[PDB]
Structure formats: C-alpha cells, structure tokens
Amino acid sequence: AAKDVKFGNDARVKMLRGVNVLADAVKVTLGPKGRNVVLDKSFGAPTITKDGVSVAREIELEDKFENMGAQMVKEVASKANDAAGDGTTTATVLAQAIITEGLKAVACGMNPMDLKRGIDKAVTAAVEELKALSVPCSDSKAIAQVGTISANSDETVGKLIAEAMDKVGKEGVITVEDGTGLQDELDVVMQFDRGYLSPYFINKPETGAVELESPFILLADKKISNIREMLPVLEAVAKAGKPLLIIAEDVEGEALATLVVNTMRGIVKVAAVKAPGFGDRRKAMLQDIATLTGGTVISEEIGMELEKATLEDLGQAKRVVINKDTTTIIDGVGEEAAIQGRVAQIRQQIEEATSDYDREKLQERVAKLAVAVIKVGAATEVEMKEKKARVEDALHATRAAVEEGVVAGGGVALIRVASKLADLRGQNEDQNVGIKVALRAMEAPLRQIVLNCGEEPSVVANTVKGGDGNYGYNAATEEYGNMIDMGILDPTKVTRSALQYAASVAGLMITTECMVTDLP
Amino acid sequence: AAKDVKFGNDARVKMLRGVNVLADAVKVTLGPKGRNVVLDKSFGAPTITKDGVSVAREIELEDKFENMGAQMVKEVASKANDAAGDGTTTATVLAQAIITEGLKAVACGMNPMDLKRGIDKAVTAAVEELKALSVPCSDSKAIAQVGTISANSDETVGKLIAEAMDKVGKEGVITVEDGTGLQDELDVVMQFDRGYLSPYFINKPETGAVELESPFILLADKKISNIREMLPVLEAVAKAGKPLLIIAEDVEGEALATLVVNTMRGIVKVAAVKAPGFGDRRKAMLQDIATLTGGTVISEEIGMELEKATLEDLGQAKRVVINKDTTTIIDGVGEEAAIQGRVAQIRQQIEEATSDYDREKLQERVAKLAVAVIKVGAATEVEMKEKKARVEDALHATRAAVEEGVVAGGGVALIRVASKLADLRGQNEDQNVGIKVALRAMEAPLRQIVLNCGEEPSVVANTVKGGDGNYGYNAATEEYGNMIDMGILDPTKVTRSALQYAASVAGLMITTECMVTDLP
Amino acid sequence: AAKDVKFGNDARVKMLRGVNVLADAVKVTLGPKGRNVVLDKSFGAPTITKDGVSVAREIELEDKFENMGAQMVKEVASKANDAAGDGTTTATVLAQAIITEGLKAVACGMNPMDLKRGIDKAVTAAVEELKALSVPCSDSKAIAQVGTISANSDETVGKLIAEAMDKVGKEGVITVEDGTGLQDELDVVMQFDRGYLSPYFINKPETGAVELESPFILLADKKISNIREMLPVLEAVAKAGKPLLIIAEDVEGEALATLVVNTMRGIVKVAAVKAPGFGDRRKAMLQDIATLTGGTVISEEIGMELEKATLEDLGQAKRVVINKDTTTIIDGVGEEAAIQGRVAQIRQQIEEATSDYDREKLQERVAKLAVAVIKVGAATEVEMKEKKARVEDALHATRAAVEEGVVAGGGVALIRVASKLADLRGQNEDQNVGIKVALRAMEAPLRQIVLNCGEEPSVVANTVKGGDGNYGYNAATEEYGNMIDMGILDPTKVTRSALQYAASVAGLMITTECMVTDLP
Ligand SMILES: Nc1ncnc2c1ncn2[C@@H]1O[C@H](COP(=O)(O)OP(=O)(O)O)[C@@H](O)[C@H]1O
Ligand SMILES: Nc1ncnc2c1ncn2[C@@H]1O[C@H](COP(=O)(O)OP(=O)(O)O)[C@@H](O)[C@H]1O
Ligand SMILES: Nc1ncnc2c1ncn2[C@@H]1O[C@H](COP(=O)(O)OP(=O)(O)O)[C@@H](O)[C@H]1O
Ligand code: BEF
Ligand code: BEF
Ligand code: BEF
Ligand SMILES: [K+]
Ligand SMILES: [K+]
Ligand SMILES: [K+]
Ligand SMILES: [Mg+2]
Ligand SMILES: [Mg+2]
Ligand SMILES: [Mg+2]
C-alpha cells in the first residue's frame, strides 16, 4: 500500500509520543506505592494487573508512527520478561529515560550512531559493575525476602516460595495454579499426566483413585491389544501376590477387558495407564521410569517380545497412586547409582539444547527423578489474577537471585554503578554525551519509585547519591536506611537484564532519521 | 486495535459512573419495599425480576471505560450468586458503597494500595465477628422464616421449603420447576424418567402401571435384540418364582416380543425399560443402580456376555413400580457400605466438576441414592418467572442458613459488626482510612433498604445503632423491634459472602491509575 | 450490546405509552359496535379481523421501552386466548385499565408491591363472586345464545354450533374449516381417513364406494405381503358367506393382487384399507376398533401369527362403507361394557396429558367411540378469514359456557362483583388503594363497549350500577334491560380468565422501577 514517509525531527517527535504512552502506562505500577492498570478484554471481564509487560503488550496506538514508537519499545518490556521474569517495568522506565535524553542530544546535532556507541559502552561497564556488587543469595531467609519484594511486599508469598525451593531442591520444578480455596497452598510430590484407562480399577472410591500397594511395574514400548502377550508375565505376578502397574503405549479393549475382570474378582490387582509423552520423548521418559524402578523397557523395536518378559524385567515401587488425570510412583526400587548416572546424562542433554523448548522438557524429567505446585488463594477472580501475576514474578526473581545473586533494591544498585562510571569516556565527544545519557538514565528507576509515592524525586535521588554502598530509600516506610538490612533485595540478573535490553532497543531508536508506514 | 488510554482521575470518574449505573439498577430491588426491574430479551417476552444478579448480568454500557467499571463490579453480584445463592443485591450495594468512599480517599492523595490493605483487614475481622453472632438454625420454624424473608415476605414459600427439607432430609435434593397449576405444589419420591417398553406388561390396570413384587433386576449395558442371550438368566428366574426387571440400553422387538408372551401367559413376570441417560452418563447411572440393588452391570465392553450371567449378577429390590413415564425401585438389597462408598465417590466427582452442568447431573444421582420437586404456581408466565426466581433464592438461603447459621436481618448484623470494629487500626494512616471506609460501607444495606421505603436512612441508621444486639428496623411494618423475634433472618453464609466479595473487587478497583481499552 | 437503562418515572411513562398503543388497537374491536383492524402481511393480502389477540400479536413498537410495555401486556391477550378461547379483548381492556390506575398511584408514592397485593386479593375474591353468579348453561337455546354473542351477534353461527353440540354430544369433537360454498355447512359422522387400497373393489359404482353388508373385520398389526397368511382366515370367511374388511398396516401387491381376483369373481367379498395412524397411536387406534367390533388385534409383536387367526378373532359390524378417502364402520358388534370400559380408560389418559397435542388426538378417539365439522361460507377470502375467526371464538365460548356456566354479559357481571367487594380491605392503606384500583378497572369492559357506540360511558355505567342482578346495557339495541332475557351471555370461564390474567401481568408491571434494553 501507499506509504506515509516522515523524516528527521517530525518522525522522532512522533516516535517519542508513542514511547511515552506505553512507558507512561507501565511506569505507574513501579514500586511498592505503585498502582494498578485495568486492561479491557473482549471475551468477558477486565483484568487488573501490576505486571508491567502485561500492560505493555496491550498498547497499540492509532497514529501509525506513534504506534511504531510504542511497538518497538514494547520489546524492552517483553524481552526482560522472557529472560528474567521480573524487572519489566524497570526495563521500560530505563528505555524511556534513555530514548528521551538521547533524542534530545540528537536534536542538538550530535551524531546518533556515536550516542549509541557511548550508551552501549557505559552499559557493558555497568553490567560488570553490577556483577561486582552482587552478593550471592542462598539461605532461605534471603530468598523469602526477594520473593516478598517481588510480590509487592507480600511476606506470605516470600515465605511460601522459600519453603517450596527448600523442598524441591534446586533441580526441582515449581508451578503456580489457581486455588479453589481462599488462602494460598503448597503441594509437593515422580508423577506424570495420565489417568487410569479403566475406571473400573479404582480400589478406593473415597478419593476416586487406585492405590496399588508395593506393586510390580511393566514398561511396554509397543501398544497392547491381545491378552496372549500378558499371560506369561501376568502369570508370575498372580503367583507372587504383589499387584502390577502396566504403563504401555496403550491398553486396547481386548486386552483391557480381561485385565478388568481379573482385578474385578481379585485374581490379580492391575492398573493400566498410557505412556507419558509422544514419539522419541515417550521412549525417553518411559526409560526414566525404568531406571527409578529397576525395570527393563520391553521395547518391541529393539528385539523383545512382551511374552518373553518375566518378573526380572518388571520395575518395583513402594506405593502407586493413579486417578482420572495423573499417575504417581512413590519411591521406586531403582538404585541411586543408576539414577544419578541417568540424571548426569540428561543434565548434559540440556547443555547441548540449542533451543528453549528442548531445554524445558529435559529439566522436567530431571525434576521427576530429583516437583511442587503453589495454589493461589483469593476471594473473587479479578483478585486471583493480580495475585497469581505477582506469585509468578516472585518465583522468577527468586530463581534468578539464586542463580546470579542480589543487589540493593530501590534502584540504588544502578545509582551506585552510575557514580562508579563517572570517569568513563569514549573516543569522541558525541560518545561521551552518550555515556552521560545512560548514567543519568540509571537514576530513573529510583526516581520513578519515589515519584509514585508523591515525593520529590530529585531530593531523594540526591540523598541516596550522597550515601554509600547499600544506603537507599525505603519507599514503603518513607525513610532511608540500609536496603539489604531492610530486606529490599533485587536479583542481580533482573537489574542487569532490565538495563541491557532497554539500552539495546533505545540505542537504535535514537538513530532514527526516517520512518515508513502505511497510510491511515 | 488502537487503544484509548486514560489515566488517573479521568479514568476513575469514568470507572465510577459505570459502577453506578449497574449498582443503581440493582439497588432498587433491595428489601421488602424493593421494586422490580424489566430486562428486554431479543427472542420474545421481557422479564420482570427482583433478583439482583439477573439485573447485573444484563448491564453493559456504551462508553468503553464506564463499561469496564460496570463489567468488573458485575463480578461481585455474580460471585455472590455462585457461592451463596442469595445476597447478590446486598453484595452489589456494599461494593458500590466501598468503591465510592475509597475513590474519594484516593482523590485525597491517600495511597490506594494501603486503602486496600485497610479494607481487607477490616473485612477479615468482620467475617469473624459475624461467625460470633451466628446462632444456628435447624428447627423447621427458623428455616421457614429464612425462606420467607428470602422470597420477599412470602410465607407459603417458607412453609413449603421447610416441609421439603423435613422430608428429603439434609442429604436429599430439592428442585424447582414451572407448575401447570395456579398454586404451588410439592412432590417427594430412587426413580428415573423411563416407562415400560411394552404396554402389554401392566399387571394392574387400576393405575395403568406394572407393580413387580420383590423382583430380580438385570442390568444390561448393551442393547438386546435376540432372546438367545436371555434364556440362561430367564431360565434361572423362571425356576426361582420371583419376577424380573430388565434395564438395558434397549429391548428390541425380537427379544421383546417373546418376553411379552411369557408374562402374557404367566411363565415369567418381566418388565423391560430403557436405561437412564445417554453415553458415559448412562453407564455411570446404570452402575449406581447396581450398587443400590447388589447386582452386576453386564457390560459387553468389559468382557462379559449376557448369556454368562446368572442369578448371581442380578440385583434385587423390595418392590418395583413402572408406568408410561417413570420407573421406581423401592428399597434395593444393596449394602449401605457399598452405597455410601459409591456416594462419597460421586460426592468428590462434584468437587472436580469445573462446569455447572457437570455438577447438576452428579448431585441428581447422589439424591437418587440418598428427592423432592417444588412446582411453582402462577396465573401467567411473566408471574411464573419472578416467582420461580424467588423460590430458588429462598431455597438457597435456607440451605445456607442450615449450614452456617443465621444473623439478624435488615442489615443490622453488619451494622453491629461495624460498631464492634470501631477500634480496629492498621499499620499507618492510609490503612486506617481504609478500615473506616469499609465500616461506613457496612451501613449501606440497612440504609438502602430504608431508602426504598422512602424514609430517611440517616434517621433509621442512627436509631438502630443506638440500640443493641438484634434491635432493628422492620421495613415491611415500618417500626423497630427485635429482628429475630420478628422472623427477619439472613443466613450468615450470605451476609458474609456478600461482604467478602464486594471487598475483594472494590478493593482492587480503588487501585486504578490507568485504563486501557479499544477505541469506539 | 450496550444497554439503555431508564429509571423510575421515565421508565414507567414509556412503558405505559407502549401498553396504550397495543391496548388502543385492540379496544376498538370490543363489543357489538366494535370495528375491525387491518393487519398487513408480507406474503400476499392483508387480514381484516375483530379478534383481539390477533391484533395484539402483531404490535411491536419502535421505541425500545415502549415496545417492552406492549410486549408484556401482549401476554394478557395471548394467555386469555390459550385458556379460554374468547375474552382476549376484554382481558386487554382490563389490563390497561389496571396498569393505568396503578401507575398513577405509584406516582403518588404508594408502594407498588402493596398495590399489587391489593389488586391480587380483590381479584381472588372477584373470581369466587363470579362462581356464585354463574348459572349453568346446558339447554341448546342458551348455548346458541352464547355462540351468537360470541360471533358478534350472528344468530346462524349460534344456531349452527348448538345443533353441532346436540349431535356429537359432549364427548364429541367439532372442527371448523374453510367452505367451498358461499353459505355455512355442518357435516357429522366411527370413521377414519383411509380409502380402499384396491380401486377394483367398488361394488357400487353409483357412489364410487364399497358397501360391505354385515361383514367380518380382520385387524392386522403387521403389514401383509403374502397370501399364505390369509388362507386360514379367508377360508373360514369363504365358507361363512359373510364379507370381510381387512384393516392392516398395509395390503401389499402379492397379497393384494389375489384378494382382488377373489372378489372380482365373487369367491369372497373383501376390502383392504391401511390402518389409521402412525407408530404407537396406530396400535392404540387399531385396538379401539377391535373393542367396537368384538375382534382381536392380531399383533405380530405380542406372539400371534396371522395364520393362527380364526373367525373367533374377527370383529363384526352391521354395515361398512369405504370410498377413495374414508372408511366407516356402522354399528359394531362389540359389547357396550367393553366399549365404555375402553372409553373411561382413554378418558383418564386425557387427564394425565400434560401436553395439548396429547389431548387432541385422545378426545378424537373417544368421539369415534361415543365427530362434526363446520364449513364456513363466504364470497371472497378476506371475508372467509374474519368469519372463520368468529366461528372459532364462538365454538370456544360455547364449550366454556358448558363447562363453567354463564353470567350476564355487557360487562355487567364484573360491575356487580365490584359492588359486592366494596367492603374489601387489606393489611394497610396502599393495599386498599390497590383493591380500589382493581374494582374501578372492573367497570372498563362495560365502559369501552358503550364508548364504541359513541355514548357516554359514565352515564351508562351509573345507570347499570343503579340497578340489580342482570340489569344491563344492550349496546346493540341501545336500551337497558335484563341481559339474560336478552340473550347477552358471556361464559363464566372467559370473564374469570380475562380478569385473572390481566391482573397477573398488570400487577407486576406496576412494580417497575428500572428498565434495561438495547440501544437503538
Ligand atoms: N519498600 C521498598 N522501597 C524501595 N524500593 C522498593 C521497595 N519494595 C520494592 N522496591 C523496589 O521497587 C522495584 C519495583 O519493581 P516492580 O514495580 O515489580 O517493577 P518490575 O517489573 O521492574 O519488577 C523493585 O525493584 C524494588 O527494588
Ligand atoms: N421486613 C423486613 N425489614 C427489614 N429488612 C428486611 C425485611 N425483609 C427482608 N429484609 C432484609 O432485606 C434484605 C433484602 O434482600 P434482597 O432484596 O432479596 O436482596 P439480596 O440479593 O441482597 O438477598 C434481606 O437481607 C433482609 O435482611
Ligand atoms: N348486544 C350487546 N350489548 C351489550 N354487550 C354485548 C352485546 N353483544 C355482546 N356484548 C358484550 O360485548 C363483549 C364483546 O366481546 P368481544 O368484542 O368479542 O371481545 P372479547 O375478545 O373480549 O370476547 C361480550 O363480552 C359481551 O358481553
Ligand atoms: F513489572 Be515486574 F514484572 F514486577
Ligand atoms: F438479590 Be438476591 F438474590 F435476593
Ligand atoms: F376478542 Be375476543 F376473542 F372475541
Ligand atoms: K510492576
Ligand atoms: K433482590
Ligand atoms: K373482539
Ligand atoms: Mg517486580
Ligand atoms: Mg433475597
Ligand atoms: Mg368475543
């Protein structure tokens, strides 16, 4: 289509106006005295949220150029989220603060492409300075604090996540789901998403689930349809007394029908459940189970018949629990040598994972061998969703603090790094201004946090910069102090991520001399 | 699409204006001197109703922001309904009254997120205070009163529900349907909607129905067409003397034809009726019958032939009654262990029911095992529907009073709790104002009830607050007295639910600093 | 969609304006000096009609609220029609007259919900008072009068319906159809809609019909295709001399072909006709015939072969008449014990009929055992349809007078009841006004009838109220007298029905404080 083409200052002013709308909608949620944003949503009720990326993703403006502005800087907030899990508002606030200052310089005749070089240099330095300030965070008290600050000063959420990480370990997974109840709730477990195939197996109608006591476990790679194949193994289990779980690709009617009438009567106690997964991942996961239980995968492809299996090839467990949705193996017989060998193998499979998706499902399996769910409580569903948004953010920050340490919150970390880089220069004057642009932007987080409390950001900024180390402003309590002593901890990873991403995008945005878009 | 983005006070004023339209449409129905709302309805006649949620669900406003207001607070009324069954108007009135007072504070510079904390704290306290005031309600007189007040002072409805609960018990179900007649009507019963397949079975032409005395019961999952399958079992029943009921998927002509000539002559006494339901629900229900009668479901799918059944697999009952429309099994042989085991299973099936429809049919079956129907009478159909709306509400309130006690109605319960929390404070001033916001809102129900009588709400409120305990205003009679003595009982569960839900939503709504929606 | 929401007086004024349009279109047809309404109709010619519900059903207004008004009160006219069959205009006139007076009171500050209670009480009383005044109506002269008044003073229609009810009895059915001729026409009949299957059976080419003299009757449930099955019975009829009628599901070619050549020659005299009905109704009706004729239904389903039938199982009749369209059995051998037993069975089948359709076909069969059609004559088709509309109304009123007696027409019945309830009071003042609202409305029918004659309704009303008993205004003749002596009879059922339904709806309509509808 025919295009509208704008140049120079006109293009930039539009680009900014756009940035500001997105920025201005997100910035209002920053900090403990941050407020919430309402996002209308076509199919049913609107959403109240503090989560900066959530606000950002919805912004789209009418004016084709302004929109372009907002649509580019939206990526800062968005990428922060995909890497860190928190800091999305901070990231957005920095980005604005750069873009704004940079463009002002561009208008003064300075060469954008150098302003960029400055900014980028100042940031590469700031990243390293932050790694210096970073003190690690591994005790449950520190983690609970990060969690708490991350969930907008909700101590329960901190406490609860800290408890969770303590229980699953570090090679273990934590999810968050909507609770039925009014208060928060933590559940801890190997399990996979498969129910009984035969609802006539439930041996405890109390729970509506099958509870096989100290059973054998048959791992069939192929899908079963004839009871002939089972007879040899079913026989040895019938003369052993112990029950049996059958985890094959599928238990077809002809061979299912029978199995039912056999437990129906009490001849053998057997359960049938599909195999966890699809394709090569199934055989991989099915193998994981064999290792935990000390059984052999009866793979039809690698020269085994299901009839030539014996008690030998069956896994064993202390207990088994299966319901309409999930199957759980409690404490398998498999030796911990074989297990941790199998784990350090899958651990290096995640190293060569060049795609995120290949990494997801792999660490899921290592957690099954080395898992927890937090259920979020609230009165209504508008409440549920702002709370659940905070819990996720908190969990992310906690995992990030663990893996990269913490720094003083209240945006002081950045303010310090800015004073430490006060001597940084570039190859020429424009690059210098570029550095100074970035350093001045580093104050923005603190400044906005203070501004959302309705106090004079210049005055607070000055007072924090007059101090040392972890002296900062506690926006919640409205007085100064030692941020680490007051539990106001941001993960290093998030503060770093915010800064890097804002800089990346904002840097480029300053180099805009022409804009091309469709006509209205 | 391009979005309209509004901030701060503008956004809030719009949000309120919206809340008020919904609120203002619902509030007019509050209390005995409440009036009705007419809701136009595209396909045919309009609806007259007092039921506050019904009005709420229809509100949708033109202005995109105002709508957002109304669409959020709509959830208060809506959730009250899903939890309690009554109090939806009250809930809505509170919500408004909070939002309004809170936003006024937000405009005074107070920190919304703290106003929220206050409100929420005041409410958590009020919930506990209400549990103190709650006296239980288990005698039929008290229940009839709750029912009566709930049905806008209709004593018949109270009386009739009280009678119903007395007869079904507490582990028994009550439904409401449109009556054909002009006056109300209660019917009480395991039974299901299926008649005889063969009209030539009626062994008592007095009633035009089959009355099988102390019979066996055959439960066939598959549909029958050949008499071959029957011969083995039919044989053992023919040499046992006792009659037989056959409840299979269907009794086809070839196998039906015969069965007739056999009872025709007196060789065996047999009835044939289709199975209750369709698909997986049929097999589920067919199984319920087996448990009540001590029989086995002869399921062709899970490896059973109909020929290999014996007297073993047949259920038994004390008596059976079947007519053109319904089949009734009176007092089955099944052991109450197996029954209540089967029930506590279906009881937890209703827990995981995430859809309303999955909940309906499940509790229907538990009533068949552990049932009454109220038919509502009215002259026209406009009348039918407002009445039926009141009966449902009443029934809900009665069931809620039973399970959580009652408190003094006329909104006095809340007014008392408010005087008891007069000393409640928070961590800081903004939180205090937040508490006071909630306590002042607690007066709104009484105030609106009085205002719908066209009398001075301040004057009545003052006079009730000057009193003690259950002193209140009786809006119907226009004079003060002891609300429990005057039968003006609200269930605790509903009063609590109203307050909790209003607070949840309204709390969040006060934290609004930005709104994002589509352009017009 | 976005809604328009109106409150209080605004909403009510709109609601009324709507009611009035519908009311005002219907009221013009009231009474003997009533006029007609023309209803445009998309597919072809318009409709002229006096029938008040017919006018009502077409009204739909542009203004969304006014429409709501009209759409609710439309139900009065509509329900009157479904219950009574006449009085739809009267009902509509009352409804208006209540709504109007009630709303005026609501505007004076009186509590709508009490105004309702008053109205309803006054009506429950009026219903009983009317049952007092009701004198029964069973002589043909009285019925002819009701019919006449009902058909807007058309004596022929009265006379003709009176003759009809006299001939079919009270357990007999009357239909009305369009006539081919220019004048009205009554036809009277056991018979059913089936002709000969074989046109080569007509033994009297004068009429073009088969006249079997004193024959046997074979009732075959199954459909016949082979002459083998017939031979046993056909044999015994061939050696008996008497002819035979065969009423089976069908007489197929192979078995039809033969039967023809046998009567063709004079070996046996046989007729073949399909069975009356479809499905379970066929077997039911086929059974009715067996009872009237003293034969057995040879039902293949309940263990009978057609070959094992003998003269035993054949019905018998005095004469049989069959043409291209219908089969008639004149005076069957069946004993009147068995017949009236079969009838009092089908009579109670119509009691449990909860659907209108289940009632239609049942009383059709009782008439066949214990039926008439009125053909309406007119010149054109515009004429046909107003006339046919009056005949139906008349027939309905006659059947209603029969079942619930009559009262003095000209709306005097209601005027009397109003003077008798002059002392009725309620629990409080608002309820009193509510009663007075209803009593004043009871004058409206008379008042409107008089007003359609262009005479002063107040003056006539006063003069009738000054009188006693059945003194009334005869609007046709324009002078006063004894309404029963002048033949001006309304059925009690209709007068009662009108009042009850108007009150039901109008009562509720007065309680309107808010209206919610879509935007324009
Ligand atoms: N009590 C406090 N005083 C000062 N700063 C705080 C306090 N609590 C949290 N913060 C800071 O405010 C920041 C707010 O983060 P948040 O508003 O969730 O946005 P983001 O998406 O950037 O995490 C945190 O980095 C933290 O350093
Ligand atoms: N006669 C009365 N006097 C005072 N209050 C009453 C009387 N009858 C009912 N109420 C109160 O009015 C409230 C009205 O409930 P209702 O209008 O049905 O709305 P909701 O959806 O809140 O139940 C009840 O909680 C009850 O306490
Ligand atoms: N000659 C008459 N004088 C007075 N009233 C009459 C006369 N003929 C009929 N009426 C009255 O007028 C009414 C007219 O009924 P109609 O206009 O058909 O409306 P509806 O639908 O109410 O039957 C009858 O109830 C009858 O009482
Ligand atoms: F805005 Be962040 F995700 F707390
Ligand atoms: F408005 Be409530 F449901 F009585
Ligand atoms: F208007 Be009524 F049906 F005579
Ligand atoms: K945020
Ligand atoms: K209500
Ligand atoms: K009329
Ligand atoms: Mg955060
Ligand atoms: Mg109520
Ligand atoms: Mg009439």
Q: Does residue A431 share a domain with residue A421? A: yes
Domain check: are A384 and A436 in the same one? no
List b or e across A271-309, with b for residues whose CB sees 16 or more CB atoms inside 10 angstroms.
Answer: bbbbbbbeeeeebbbbbbbbbbbbbbbbeeeeebebeeb
| A380 touching B (Cβ < 8 Å) | yes
Number of H helices and E strands in chain B, helices first, is: 18, 19
Judgement on whether residues C130 and C39 belong to the same structural domain of the protein: yes
Please name the member of B28, B59, B378 whose beta carbon is closest to the beta carbon of C513: B28
Residues near ligand 3 (Cβ within 6 A): C 29-32, 34, 52, 86-90, 149, 153, 409-411, 449, 473-476, 488, 490
Whether C512 and B37 lie within 8 Å, measured CB to CB: yes
Angle at A421 between CA A416 and CA A425, to 5 degrees: 165
Q: Which ligand is located closest to the Cα atom of residue B32?
A: 2
* Closest ligand 3 atom to Cα of C472: 4
Is B33 annotated in a binding site? The answer is no
Tell me how far apart the alpha carbons of residues C215 and C329 are, in angstroms, rounded to a whole number. Answer: 10
Overall residue count recorded for chain C in this entry: 520
The two tokens of residue A30 are 């920053």
CB contact under 8 A, B504 and A382: yes
CB count in 10 Å sphere of residue C415 = 24
Give me the residues near ligand 7 (ion), CB cutoff below 5 Å: A 29, 50, 52, 89
Specify whether B65 is located in the same domain as B14: yes
Method for structure elucidation: X-ray
Tell me how far the alpha carbon of residue C29 lies from the centroid of ligand 3, in angstroms.
9
How many whole angstroms separate alpha carbon C394 and alpha carbon C147?
Answer: 5
Instruction: Answer yes or no: do C213 and C170 share one domain.
Output: no
CA distance B380 to chain C (A): 6
Q: Using CA atoms, how far apart are residues C75 and C54, in angstroms rounded to an integer?
A: 12
Q: Which residues of A define the annotated binding site?
A: 29-32, 50, 86-90, 410, 474-476, 490
Residues of A in contact with B76 (CB under 8 A): 380
For the annotated binding site of A for ATP, the residues are 29-32, 50, 86-90, 410, 474-476, 490
Q: Are A91 and A51 in contact (CB under 8 A)?
A: no
Q: Can you tell me which residue has the tokens 């992310």?
A: A396
User: What residues of B are in contact with residue A207 (Cβ under 8 Å)?
Assistant: 348
Ligand 5 pocket residue status of B52, Cβ below 6 Å: yes
Chain A residues close to B516, C-beta within 8 Å: 25, 37-40, 55, 58-59
Say if residues A185 and A395 touch (Cβ distance below 8 Å).
no
Sign of the CA dihedral with C351 first, then C355, C356, and C359 last? negative
Task: Give CA C121 to chain center in angstroms.
Answer: 30
Q: Which residues pair with C490 in a beta bridge?
A: C407
Whether residue A59 lies within 8 A of chain B, CB to CB, comes out as yes
Residue that is written with structure tokens 């295009």 in the block: A3
Number of CB pairs, chain A paired with chain B, less than 8 A apart = 128
Choosing among C6, C106, C362, C508, which should be mutated to test the B contact, i.e. which has the most B CBs within 10 A?
Answer: C508
Please indicate whether residue B51, judged by its CB atom, sits closer than 6 Å to ligand 5. yes
Residue C508 has its nearest CB partner, among B55, B386, B454, at B386
DSSP label of B223:
P
Q: Would you say how long chain B is, in residues?
A: 520
Q: First and final CA of chain C: distance in angstroms? A: 10
C-alpha–C-alpha distance, residues A433 and A391, integer Å: 40
Considering the domain architecture, whether residues A235 and A318 belong to the same structural domain is answered as yes
How many of the other CB atoms lie within 10 Å of CB of C358? 12
Residue partners of C84: CB distance under 8 A and separation at least 6: C396, C397, C400, C491, C493, C494, C497, C498
Residues 453-492 of B with CB under 8 A from C: 453-454
Q: Which chains touch C (3 or more CB pairs under 8 A)?
A: B
* Main-chain dihedrals φ then ψ at residue A174, nearest 5 degrees: -125, 125
Could you tell me if C71 and C64 are in contact, meaning their C-beta atoms sit under 8 angstroms apart? Answer: no
Greatest alpha-carbon span in chain A:
91
**Which atom of ligand 4 is least distant from the CA of A150?**
4
Question: Strands A327-332 and A315-323: what pairing?
Answer: antiparallel
Instruction: Flag if A55 and B79 touch (Cβ within 8 Å).
Output: no
A228's CB contacts (< 8 A; 6+ apart) are: A307
CATH number at residue C387: 3.30.260.10
Q: Return residues 384-413 of A near B (CB < 8 Å).
A: 386
Do C and A share at least 3 CB pairs under 8 Å? no
Which residues are near ligand 1 (CB < 6 Å)? A 29-32, 34, 52, 86-90, 149, 153, 409-410, 449, 473-476, 488, 490
Q: Could you tell me the CATH number of the domain that includes residue B487?
A: 1.10.560.10
Please say whether the dihedral angle defined by the alpha carbons of residues C137, C141, C145 and C151, taken in this order, is positive or negative. positive
- Write out the residue range of the structural domain in which residue A335 sits: 190-369
Q: Do A40 and B64 touch (CB under 8 A)?
A: yes
CA C157 to ligand 9 center in whole angstroms: 16
Which residues from C are below 8 Å from B34, CB to CB?
Answer: 113
Q: Are strands C372-376 and C185-188 parallel, antiparallel or unpaired?
A: antiparallel
Nearest to C109 by CA among B34, B37, B454: B454
Which residues does B237 contact at the CB level (< 8 Å), separation at least 6?
B216, B243, B244, B268, B270, B311, B314
- Determine the distance separating the centroid of ligand 7 and the alpha carbon of A431, expressed in angstroms: 32
Strand A47-49 relative to strand B471-474: parallel, antiparallel, unpaired?
A: unpaired
| DSSP 3-state of C515 | strand
Q: Nearest Cα to C387, choosing from C40, C49, C54, C33?
A: C49
Residue of chain A minimizing CA distance to B342: A205
When divided into structural domains, chain C yields a total of 3
Q: Which residues make Cβ contacts (< 8 Å) with residue A125, sequence separation at least 6?
A: A421, A424
Residue C221 to residue C305: CA distance in whole angstroms: 10
CB contact under 8 A, A206 and B341: yes
The shortest CB-CB distance from A36 to any of B5, B304, B513 is to B513
State whether B509 and A48 contact (CB < 8 Å).
yes
Same domain, A39 and A140: no
Residue A217, SS3 per DSSP: strand
Q: How big is the CA angle at C160 (ends C155 and C163), to the nearest 5 degrees?
A: 125
The answer to whether residues C462 and C411 belong to one domain is yes
Determine the Cα–Cα distance for residues B223 and A121; give it in Å rounded to an integer.
Answer: 80
Distance CA C268, CA C247 (A): 16
Out of A62, A256, A324, the one facing B519 most closely (by C-beta) is: A62
User: Best residue in A29, A38, A452 to probe B by mutation, most B CBs within 10 Å?
Assistant: A38
Do B390 and B519 share a domain, yes or no?
Answer: no
Token representation of residue B19: 């809340």
Q: Which residues of A touch B68 (CB under 8 A)?
A: 38, 40, 46
Find all residues with CB under 8 Å of B433, minimum gap 6, and list them.
B105, B110, B115, B118
Interface of B with A in 78-97 (CB under 8 A): 79
A28 and chain B in contact, CB less than 8 A:
yes
Looking at the fold, whether B194 and B334 belong to one and the same domain comes out as: yes
Same-domain pairing of A217 and A320 = yes
Which pairs from B180-184 meet CB under 8 Å and 24+ separation?
B180/B375, B180/C354, B181/B375, B181/B377, B182/B377, B182/B378, B182/B379, B183/B377, B184/B156, B184/B157, B184/B160, B184/B374, B184/B375, B184/B376, B184/B377
| Residue B436 C-alpha from the chain's centroid | 34
Q: Around Cβ C127, how many Cβ atoms within 10 Å?
A: 17
Q: Which one of C514, C517, C518, C519 makes the best mutation probe of the B interface by having the most chain B beta carbons within 10 Å?
A: C514
Q: Does B62 touch chain A (CB under 8 A)?
A: no
Resolution in A: 3.6
Identify the closest residue of chain B to A197 by CA–CA distance.
Answer: B302
Q: Are residues A391 and A441 in the same domain?
A: no
